[PDB]
Amino acid sequence: DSQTLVVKLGTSVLTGGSRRLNRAHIVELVRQCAQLHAAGHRIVIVTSGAIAAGREHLGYPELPATIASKQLLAAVGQSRLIQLWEQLFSIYGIHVGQMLLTRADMEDRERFLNARDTLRALLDNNIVPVINENDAVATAEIKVGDNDNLSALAAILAGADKLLLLTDQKGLYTADPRSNPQAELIKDVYGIDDALRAIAGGMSTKLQAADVACRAGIDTIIAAGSKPGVIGDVMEGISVGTLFHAQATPLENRKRWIFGAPPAGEITVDEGATAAILERGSSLLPKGIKSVTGNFSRGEVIRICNLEGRDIAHGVSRYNSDALRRIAGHHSQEIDAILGYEYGPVAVHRDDMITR
Amino acid sequence: DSQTLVVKLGTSVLTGGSRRLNRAHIVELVRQCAQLHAAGHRIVIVTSGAIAAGREHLGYPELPATIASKQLLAAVGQSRLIQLWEQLFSIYGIHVGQMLLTRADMEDRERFLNARDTLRALLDNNIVPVINENDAVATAEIKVGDNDNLSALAAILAGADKLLLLTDQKGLYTADPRSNPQAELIKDVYGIDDALRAIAGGMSTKLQAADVACRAGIDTIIAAGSKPGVIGDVMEGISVGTLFHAQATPLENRKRWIFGAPPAGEITVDEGATAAILERGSSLLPKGIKSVTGNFSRGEVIRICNLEGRDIAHGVSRYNSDALRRIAGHHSQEIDAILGYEYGPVAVHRDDMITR
Amino acid sequence: DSQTLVVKLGTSVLTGGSRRLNRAHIVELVRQCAQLHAAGHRIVIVTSGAIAAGREHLGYPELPATIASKQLLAAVGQSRLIQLWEQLFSIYGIHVGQMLLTRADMEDRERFLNARDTLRALLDNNIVPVINENDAVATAEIKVGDNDNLSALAAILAGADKLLLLTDQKGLYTADPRSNPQAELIKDVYGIDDALRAIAGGMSTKLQAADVACRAGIDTIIAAGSKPGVIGDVMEGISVGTLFHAQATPLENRKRWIFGAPPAGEITVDEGATAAILERGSSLLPKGIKSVTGNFSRGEVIRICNLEGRDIAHGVSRYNSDALRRIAGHHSQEIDAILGYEYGPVAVHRDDMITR
């Protein structure tokens, strides 16, 4: 039973509170992740600490305290940190791939589809994707977030089963553990209400990320990065911290994604593809397309019906309107001949469509 | 209570039987060694596997199965393996220094002293010395030994308290474990006898190395490299394999080293230095020397006598006869001004001398 | 017309007088050497600067001024320098191989043969050998030499055609260039006499190295490392500095090597191998051996005659007396079966023998 796990590592976990990255803890976590990878699971890593790597590489210069210094250090430390991740993961014979993403890219339909395709290719080819935020075009308010909303968005994009947030605390406590000897860790959370937001107050950003991930049907686990064997225990289901259960199922998330906006296009499908879609629930091939009406772009939701005009599905288009019109009625192997590029052999995937 | 430990790693331990080095086992062993190093102990590493590193670096070419190919692969793999060791040890903030030694150097009187000085400097500066065999001038019969005797020689040179040999087998068995269900591991050995050599039949080389180390007053341990926490348990004193106890004391080994050969020269010492040598057991300084008789090189054993001519000690000279005559009667700070080089402030160290 | 060139790089050339290695000049020289290697020639590199690399790697510590500190720095700088050389040479797709040698190894008969075999294998497999001095067992007087006698010995060992010594000066001048405006560079030198030794006074060590190389039949060239295209011009024969012509021919050097000492052994050869040796000047195979009298080691000079007892050659034995006796009269492919190791298919090579 293969599973997809997103591990988010904050700067506190990576550095241990010091001014430089502590490679011992990182190599321990890499050992756990490599054990999981050998077991057959899929691992996605959201990381931070580019500024620390940039400071270390530059010989710790006496830069003025300004956002420009932060941007420069991030620019150097992105390369330095990806190099460090490659070095640590190559011990266990695992390749890694850099992925710089921003929230605006996730908002855009076409950029979202492109990022999802790249991540899926990386995961299929047994390569660990290391995801960070593009700090060259980011703002200070984004910098103070420390890759929490980005972690939730990456978990949604990867179609993961669990999102593990690693912290310095053990999780969520009912009261203050220092003042109250009776304060105890909360093990299971079924709904993020105002009471929880009042209990914990930067745990607020992690709570928002957990809420976002749970509304998409992904379980969220908050634990301490220093706990031995935390990642493996999370995989096996052993309780190690605070667990936020998924509020919905991925089918509901897909329905919300498809029906969130009105369709931006319209296509028509012949009898054979209609029977395949309805009876078997398979994908849609360009051969079955007959007419393409309306103008849209790749990644936008379109409407699929038969010749009679009765709606049968709503699906995410993998090609724009012009490409779909040009390749309509042709075999899947001719697409590269017609367009000069190929996004895949299907026009609408079976997992990106809802049949009504 | 800091201790000196020499860890010997064979090709089978490093590679696991495969064609290339397995970095997971090496990184686990490096983690254990780094824990010991942070605890305040001194670690020396004797290693093999240059041929595997050379094969991997060269893209696994097809060379004829000869000794020239082995020498070339060793030449490339020495650099490759030292790079790997340095990379693995830099995770825990530990520096690594390469040493290449041969049995002829250990047999030589002056080369032994030079190598001991280099190793002592490396250990005093918190740098792990990685010792291998110079395969450029080595023979095939040396190659088939797999650094077994070199480990004992390095343990004697470093003045180690324990010598750890990592193998595939758990240690020494009374009978064949495969055939005899009653055969059990031997925990302690107090004297290597002909029955023991008949019991184990390359375990013979390891037995010879253990005998050499034990006759010099060093406890030897044979255990499996795959056993978790083997190095830490060996340091702590817990039983993990076969233990060969030291048949002699380091004082006896020093006496054997000093009196194994007749003195090659004689020097005269005034009254104050004589009192310091006898009453307090301190070292000998160039100021106290009054006369130098005979011709000898650095490292040779010489006789120290007072003004009256009565023999009072024997000791290993840190300077040859010419330099000793040139710096006799001068302060220790002027040596570099006289000879152009300095081997230290003392002429005969107190730990390299026997007082009689 | 392939040629073998030995390039000696002192610490002044490598560092430029600074405290660290200057990689720009080194990469320029590496570019020239790579051009030569692609042209089809053979390049051997004798290098220095381990102390500078060790200082740079250790973060420039405040070590006391002692020979112990020198050895401590060299132990790390050897690995760092070999890593730098490999990194710079890999730009042009050339592999390098480390070779640590001492004078005593060259003096030894068997170690000389082992080193020559390793160097020949490295040269044959298109790998650049980087030769340095084993500082772990070296003395201060060796350290102050800066690899000049070692460079000459390596040139003799490699059978090179030219030995290029790179300096900071342009070569040898008749008088002091600063004081005398009429002082001019000496272009050709045919004999190192006392006048030249009086003219140049550390140019003396380089003069001794040039004399040693010239007495072995190797042309020596002293030039400035900063001159553009110096190595290529040396290969093409263009005059760039001071040239010391070879006093003898390699045949005379081989005669001196063979007849320097009386033979240490005696073997007998049948009619077919005798005819092959005398008429054709071919090598000697173990099949032709009939009797082996005397005890000797590998690399020592032995006497070869026929059944009649008339001396026909003096050669260098590639096997010791015991191995030669065991493999006498057998085919070349059985040697590994008989001894467990193979030094080659011949007993005495055609280039290591003199037929009288």
Place this chain on the structure above:
Amino acid sequence: DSQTLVVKLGTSVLTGGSRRLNRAHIVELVRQCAQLHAAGHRIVIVTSGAIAAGREHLGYPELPATIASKQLLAAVGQSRLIQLWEQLFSIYGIHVGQMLLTRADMEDRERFLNARDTLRALLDNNIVPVINENDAVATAEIKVGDNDNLSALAAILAGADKLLLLTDQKGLYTADPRSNPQAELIKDVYGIDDALRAIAGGMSTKLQAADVACRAGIDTIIAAGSKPGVIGDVMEGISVGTLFHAQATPLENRKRWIFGAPPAGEITVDEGATAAILERGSSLLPKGIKSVTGNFSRGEVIRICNLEGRDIAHGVSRYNSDALRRIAGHHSQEIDAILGYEYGPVAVHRDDMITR
């Protein structure tokens, strides 16, 4: 949704009724199988036609009609046929591994486990296993079966989801299609009764194989090998021939396999492993073993309890009694050190055990 499919190809399908293998039909089927393999499924091939390949390779010689000629032709044609399969599959970049099996091997517990392990390794490493019958030790009655019971046994061994039998006819007909114009193909069969055995009378062997596969919880499909796209349509669930539905579920098959015979051994498990087995349903590691009572072999069913003695599971042992006793209480990575071989890190797999 990856699936495992076993495709059985009789000699009639492979040869088309001629005297030699028809490579066009075979390459078409190989194209379909390669499409499935690229889609992500697992394919196992049971094949025949060794005699035809042997006849073709030997130049069609004139042997007498005897079983000895059949055995000789099978001996040559096994190699010839595996070569042909590898050659045809290499067009699509797929590797092929030969597997020769007999019924008696499936009857034996240890041989069954070894064959299952080999097949699982082949499937995991993306290599298509080609399974045939060992004709060197087979009888004529086995030869006349044409690999039907062997196909069912291989489907059971591989844990396949569907077993596709390719024939010359389209499937099972209610009456004789030639005589009766109203005879129609039977699409779904839910139970193999005496009526079906009377309807079809060599379809009887295929009916027996289908019954054997269905009693193990595997759907069976009988179709014509000449139908275009039969394999793909079978994967998609499209009806192409006669379908025999699974009578049971794989859980019942596992229960029958485990409880078919009384346990041949008894082991004891500590508290942590007991909790892992009962609460989480995980595998059993050698660390948790405490006592091993009884004598058994690898692959035999043993009883697992806790210290109190209450039975908690029945499982297939991956090691024999002696190996389990020797590795009891040790870590999984020490097994190779203790035994000299390793069957895996677990003692009883989670899928080979039933918890009661």
Place this chain on the structure above:
Amino acid sequence: DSQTLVVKLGTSVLTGGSRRLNRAHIVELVRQCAQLHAAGHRIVIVTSGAIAAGREHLGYPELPATIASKQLLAAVGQSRLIQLWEQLFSIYGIHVGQMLLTRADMEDRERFLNARDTLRALLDNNIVPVINENDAVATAEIKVGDNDNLSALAAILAGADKLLLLTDQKGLYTADPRSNPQAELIKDVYGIDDALRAIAGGMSTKLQAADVACRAGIDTIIAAGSKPGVIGDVMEGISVGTLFHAQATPLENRKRWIFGAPPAGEITVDEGATAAILERGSSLLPKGIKSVTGNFSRGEVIRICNLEGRDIAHGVSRYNSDALRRIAGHHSQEIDAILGYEYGPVAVHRDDMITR
């Protein structure tokens, strides 16, 4: 005087110690075997090295060092190795037939007869049988033997006159040849005693195989595979290694085979067939059988008695009891018409019977 020779080739002989098969040595051995085959002799080959061929074919991938990887490699290596053998033997116009055998098959009464029939057919039709071990159902303890006992079993099965074992060592030495200059090769051995077992320490497996072969009346020879013309000299009777003479005669081995177990059945023979069996020592035909008593399978030993009931012979039955009863009293040409298969014209062969 045609002879049957079984040649066993280990992994070390085939590969020379490298990672892949060395085809020059194999082609030389194939040339010698082809010369013997053209001379009119019969050659059987027992071979190893499937793992090396599998590694080479798969592009030398990186699998974990486990028995599962070994089986995975051997699965494709069997096909690759048989292909290589066929390609090398086709140069001299000789066909090759693959056989896969295990010790269990040799222990079985009927599988032994089937394998013997297949081998006899292959030898009679001038086809070289290449025998290996079925690694799909083999164990690790079987793998570590390197086909040593399988060679003896195949020599017994084939009725060979000589068994040749090719090793790296020249044979058996009285003492250690390396340490003792007086140690010399043992030329002839007449009885394997405990002294020889103590002398040789995988030489033990070869000694066990030699003992098994010699107790069956087959001369065994141990020699080096690298010796030129070893196979031809072995055939001619020239001494090349260590020779173990046959302690018994083939008639004694036949008596041991026949009388090792009590008869499983009884048949009655009329007067003419009784006279043919006794006076002329001919085979037994189904026409002469008058009654069959008991139940037994093919290959079991049965008692043959005349009409009076007096025991006259024992013999191995080529048919089971049912077929013997069905074909009793019929001509040899009708057997195929009665049973649907034929094992030969005789019921008990004259070489499988003992007449008393």
